[PDB]
Symmetry: C3
Subunit: 494 residues, 3 copies
Amino acid sequence: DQICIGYHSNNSTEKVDTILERNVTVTHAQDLLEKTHNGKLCKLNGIPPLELGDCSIAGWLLGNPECDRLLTVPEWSYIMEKENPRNGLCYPGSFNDYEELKHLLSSVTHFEKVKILPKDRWTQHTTTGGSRACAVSGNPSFFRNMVWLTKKGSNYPVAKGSYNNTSGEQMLVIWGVHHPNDEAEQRTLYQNVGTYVSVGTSTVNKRSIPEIATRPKVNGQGGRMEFSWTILDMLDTINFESTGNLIAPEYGFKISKRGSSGIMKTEGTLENCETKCQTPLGAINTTLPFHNIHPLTIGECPKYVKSEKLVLATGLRNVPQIELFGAIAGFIEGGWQGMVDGWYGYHHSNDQGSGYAADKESTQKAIDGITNKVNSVIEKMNTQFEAVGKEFSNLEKRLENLNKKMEDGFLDVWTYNAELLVLMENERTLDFHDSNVKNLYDKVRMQLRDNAKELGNGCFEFYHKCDDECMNSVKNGTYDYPKYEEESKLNRNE
Amino acid sequence: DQICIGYHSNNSTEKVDTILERNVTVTHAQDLLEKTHNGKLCKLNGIPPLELGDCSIAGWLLGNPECDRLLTVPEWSYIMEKENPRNGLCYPGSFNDYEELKHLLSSVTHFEKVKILPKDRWTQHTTTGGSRACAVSGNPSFFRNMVWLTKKGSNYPVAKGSYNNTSGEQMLVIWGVHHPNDEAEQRTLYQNVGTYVSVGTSTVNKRSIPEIATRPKVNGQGGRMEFSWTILDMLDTINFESTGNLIAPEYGFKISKRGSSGIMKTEGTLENCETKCQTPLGAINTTLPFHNIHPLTIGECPKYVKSEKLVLATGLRNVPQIFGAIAGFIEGGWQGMVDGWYGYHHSNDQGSGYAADKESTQKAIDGITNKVNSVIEKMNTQFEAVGKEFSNLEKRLENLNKKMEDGFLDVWTYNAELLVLMENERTLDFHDSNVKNLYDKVRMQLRDNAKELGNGCFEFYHKCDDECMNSVKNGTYDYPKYEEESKLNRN
Amino acid sequence: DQICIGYHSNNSTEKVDTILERNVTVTHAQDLLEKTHNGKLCKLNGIPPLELGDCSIAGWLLGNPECDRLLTVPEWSYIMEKENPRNGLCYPGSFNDYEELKHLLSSVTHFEKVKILPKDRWTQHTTTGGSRACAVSGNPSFFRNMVWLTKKGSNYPVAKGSYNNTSGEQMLVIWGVHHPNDEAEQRTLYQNVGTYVSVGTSTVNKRSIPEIATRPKVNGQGGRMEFSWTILDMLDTINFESTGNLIAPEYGFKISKRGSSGIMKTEGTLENCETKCQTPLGAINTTLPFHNIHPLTIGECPKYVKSEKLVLATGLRNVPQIESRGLFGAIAGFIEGGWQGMVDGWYGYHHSNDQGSGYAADKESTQKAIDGITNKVNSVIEKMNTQFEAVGKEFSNLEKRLENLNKKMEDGFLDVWTYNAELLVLMENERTLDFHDSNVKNLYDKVRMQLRDNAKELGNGCFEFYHKCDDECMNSVKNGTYDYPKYEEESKLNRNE
Ligand SMILES: *[C@@H]1O[C@H](CO)[C@@H](O[C@@H]2O[C@H](CO)[C@@H](O)[C@H](O)[C@H]2NC(C)=O)[C@H](O)[C@H]1NC(C)=O
Ligand SMILES: *[C@@H]1O[C@H](CO)[C@@H](O[C@@H]2O[C@H](CO)[C@@H](O)[C@H](O)[C@H]2NC(C)=O)[C@H](O)[C@H]1NC(C)=O
Ligand SMILES: *[C@@H]1O[C@H](CO)[C@@H](O[C@@H]2O[C@H](CO)[C@@H](O)[C@H](O)[C@H]2NC(C)=O)[C@H](O)[C@H]1NC(C)=O
Ligand SMILES: *[C@@H]1O[C@H](CO)[C@@H](O)[C@H](O)[C@H]1NC(C)=O
Ligand SMILES: *[C@@H]1O[C@H](CO)[C@@H](O)[C@H](O)[C@H]1NC(C)=O
Ligand SMILES: *[C@@H]1O[C@H](CO)[C@@H](O)[C@H](O)[C@H]1NC(C)=O
Ligand SMILES: *[C@@H]1O[C@H](CO)[C@@H](O)[C@H](O)[C@H]1NC(C)=O
Ligand SMILES: *[C@@H]1O[C@H](CO)[C@@H](O)[C@H](O)[C@H]1NC(C)=O
Ligand SMILES: *[C@@H]1O[C@H](CO)[C@@H](O)[C@H](O)[C@H]1NC(C)=O
Ligand SMILES: *[C@@H]1O[C@H](CO)[C@@H](O)[C@H](O)[C@H]1NC(C)=O
């Protein structure tokens, strides 16, 4: 008659990591890292994104003739842009505060083009100007959303234009100034010398003087156009005045939707899916709390860590019994492969029956503790750092370096935190299982007191031939020492 | 004869958290977080702050007629500014490098107004300009610290003015340029076209051309005024030259005190109390090492963590035991003991007792005190937040600042919570291990002359008195003396 | 008739820190912090640095007469500069985007000077202008790399100049504009009022108008010179045009090597060494993974932490057996201290038979403990290689907010990593000491379980057998193949007595 104490064993092959030891096989393990994507760009919560193709943001907003499919655009969830777009400013020039405009657009979802200064209103100027830089079917053309004002006949009168915003939302207005390359061009276009362009709102006051200089030919042109933008508030008016060199707007952009969006730098095309998280390399469909695909992300999906494997050890160490009679063994030499009922067991051999009964109170406590540990580990890492895309100009290298260093540092800190937490928790889990088995064995030894012959394999042979009910009493904790101690003493005295 | 090993219990209802367990009752605990404030603004170390009221920094430094109570200002600890002040620039315009000026002012404690260009020196111009934008009792007026220069008759001679910084410290100077709305206003105000304003020092060199354009009316005016500033070093000179459109200064602001200060964005008011540090919501009065009121504080007071609870366990589990034959540590704690933590219940032929141990308890107390001190000390070099202001065209910089501060606060909060949880686990395991070690020590000393009852203590196989049990407690138990006695009774 | 279980103690004196106790003596420990330097500025991989001396970057690039030894410079590994150099802009003025130029130079290793606008192409102007602000031997002079254009007679024709970049690499070009102090100076120098300076490239378009004003005298002059720069791409053209106030370049700087370098603020002089990384205070020669000298380093060498000590406990606890029973006295075990006669391993099996004694060492436990501790040290060192490295940056007088942001970011990351390292060391020390204690207890418990009841424990660390044993039985107990069913009768018979 003997009750033996041991633990569970199975045929799992999962391997976890520990600070003191690597390459450790366990019974059950939980994976927290997702490393798979479908590699396709597609729709976020039913709203397709805005595909710019070979066009840039400036080329879309100004109305490049090549970007003629973006004249009217529906609601979008994010914007696809290429690293080096081909169709930008067809006429060579610059764009003031381009990165600030992109940052503002990174949180706008829909637009609404409003005709604020119709082309027919300029009855004292010529509005059919064009250039060969932006040519359609050989003939010269121009930006579709802007008007090029030139002299009519031989005089260029003072040009005035105003607009009072009553559209119900904030508005985006873009204008420009032309810089010719010689006085002959200036006289043949505007007939005046010493011109100015003045723009004035309630908070904006600018005066621009054109600069005439010789420059290298870009797109076959020596001149340049400089573009500026502003945000017009509700019930606020904008005023234009110029004696020449004014590229007046015709359309204003009204902010309609607003929301959470972004500009994603990719070179792919939109496919047919339905996803919830989108990365530049692909989409993610998972319920795991971590991922290692790309730091930049639009939507809702797990956090980012630079790790290759994050596995949490939930079960016990997998060391079997190493492959005739009386081999009931114990937890000293290994686990039991034939329990499959619980975690810590009470294998027994009574004079009439034998079995592999499993404990219930200790297993429940261990499971509750492990589940609490897993939940705490997950809940400690939902306040991580999220990266937001930003763009910088050629003369903003210090700021770009600062941003990159900040992002990299925070990412490294959080990765280190996650790895250290997983390793330490694995160590404590294995120690916890060993301690629980030892505590069970010690409690049974204390209860059995003297009427037991401890064998050293992990279990003890009784000094009395006590039946089942005695043994369920031992397992339950209600073993009565003086009930049957006289017979045990008599048997031991032999 | 029985000697039982156990642990102390009481009636406390303090709960701590752990990685494996939640809401565990402990005998003793320490709170590390303050969550209360008086909801008031008052003096920092006896120096009252500077209450702007319905005014802004630009309106105070330029001399807005509504801010006439700030013409002379004493020493201050911090500046109270509303989010959207009403009295700023009376005449519409703009201020160049405003945020840099605020950043500079955040480390200045006292000013001193010095008359650097008296109004009467401009004997070839008119210095009685005004506007209805800032009018007092109907009649037009102007900024009190600046001079508007206008025709004298029908001519505007070239205006020249210089100042040499012999005051004693650095000085702040402000000047302005006027942009009219039409040529008629320019001709009736200055009688010149194509004017300029030139300012030059040993470092700065500027020349501004006025702009004339049609603009929407703000405060009833279509014109604008553009203001600039510079810091004049000691024994340096500043020169003014203009043929028109010049708003010249009359006073300069000398940096007198310097120190550590800040600007608070609050809508409250100053009342009569005293504090050691101040937050925008109220004052803090504590000796605790953490708080969760507001990240931006001025003074000397604890670190900020975005947490609702931070409790450290400095005691044992509260599991009280529930006739005769007093049990031990297997069944639970003892309420009788009041002296120490680890128990050595005393029972004998003539008297019993509830004696404590003075060796293990001292070691445990020293270890726990060292742990608490290490936890508090390892966190005295954590991040602190400093206020900053950004313009409408610096949203990327503002986002970078906000993200950096938020990330550092999150990192430190995570560190705090993880440390507290791990230390609580370690403390509970430490106390259990200490009790087990005491029991094992007693069992090792008592080889065979005792029998294990199994519930936490032994019954001796031999008769003894207080001497034997005191020897057991002191680790001087000797086997050979009472050996034959026990071997006889073992039969 | 006695085997005993114990551990190892020696003559060491190293001390470690623990989260529960301070200044604990351990047998072996490993240091991870380097706190020494030679206090010298030396070569980096055989390439000497660029010694500016009393000159600034602007003075070197523009060609100050005092910096005449830097006209031709070889390859460099880093740049040594002073906090407040004396010889900068000889003629007073400014330098637009100075800090951006310094940031660009922080990744350039060699320069090669190309003559792009020879001084003799200006056949309609005067190219011998000079000033007394920077004069050699009393006679007036000017920047050696730039040309000051003035009148030839009583006229100033329009000046034009172009260059096509066929040098094979990106190029740095610097020009300037002169602001006089009165109209008399302007007429004496140019005979033109309303002049302009226009510079135009593929992506650059600028136009400057000189400003005339009265300013205080700096180095005896009331005028200022404003300098601008640009980077010229390959196969691109730069155009110049001015009616006056043009300070044209003669040489252009061609980027040749490129690499990882920086600008170091020091007041020292170069000496003869060969180091692998350099700090502003000195050079470092170490194999440790940490140092606490200076946050700004150039080269390859360990990470930086604000700590005074970082010692890892790789050994046991030094608690020697203070009591020493002279001659007579049984040898105790592990409860009352460690042993000194042990010289082989950490956990031992001292035995005392009738034909001799011994101090043997268990090899199964010692090797496992060594493997575990080595893995622990390797993991600790590995986890801290993804630290934060600081980079020097310069800011102007109107960028205080950005400077504060940079300083706070660097400092905060520094404190975070220092805290991480210190906490890891403390916790690992605690776990190591408890690990050794648990290993000794496990050895004792294992032998007790194997040996069952054929002995009597004395509680001092070991037990005396109830039967006669020899070297074979000692070896069987130590190895783990003790045979109970062959001694039970004799053991019981002896114990009954
Ligand atoms: C721009 O349009 C708004 C709306 O029509 C104008 O605001 C109105 O101004 C008149 C003044 O004659 C008031 O009587 C109305 O009550 C105003 N309406 C609202 C809704 O406030 C505004 O004046 C126009 N801007 C300009 C420069 O004329
Ligand atoms: C501003 O004032 C200071 C001191 O009043 C002037 O410095 C003095 O200059 C004279 C030149 O004639 C010297 O003789 C003195 O020794 C200087 N004194 C000191 C204390 O340095 C300074 O020159 C004045 N600024 C200007 C532009 O003249
Ligand atoms: C600068 O020099 C390059 C190379 O010498 C010029 O590029 C050549 O342009 C001509 C056009 O007339 C082509 O026929 C050649 O094939 C080009 N050569 C190369 C190597 O690309 C370039 O045109 C010059 N810049 C200017 C403004 O003329
Ligand atoms: C297990 O073997 C070695 C242990 O040192 C380890 O390097 C290796 O990576 C492990 N095996 C796998 C498949 O990772
Ligand atoms: C995401 O994966 C789940 C698997 O649980 C699947 O049922 C679901 O259809 C997937 N979603 C998409 C959009 O493919
Ligand atoms: C204590 O915390 C547990 C979470 O495990 C919660 O279920 C319980 O309600 C809490 N007790 C009280 C009194 O709030
Ligand atoms: C701060 O609290 C203490 C209580 O410890 C009290 O004595 C003191 O008066 C308080 N300070 C003020 C300003 O009320
Ligand atoms: C301790 O003993 C060792 C013996 O190997 C010796 O080398 C060392 O110098 C001694 N230390 C002191 C401080 O005497
Ligand atoms: C070692 O640390 C303890 C801290 O408990 C301190 O009291 C002692 O002075 C220290 N010893 C030395 C030599 O620094
Ligand atoms: C660096 O130190 C080692 C000793 O650890 C020495 O052998 C080597 O010569 C030193 N290097 C130099 C450059 O002095």
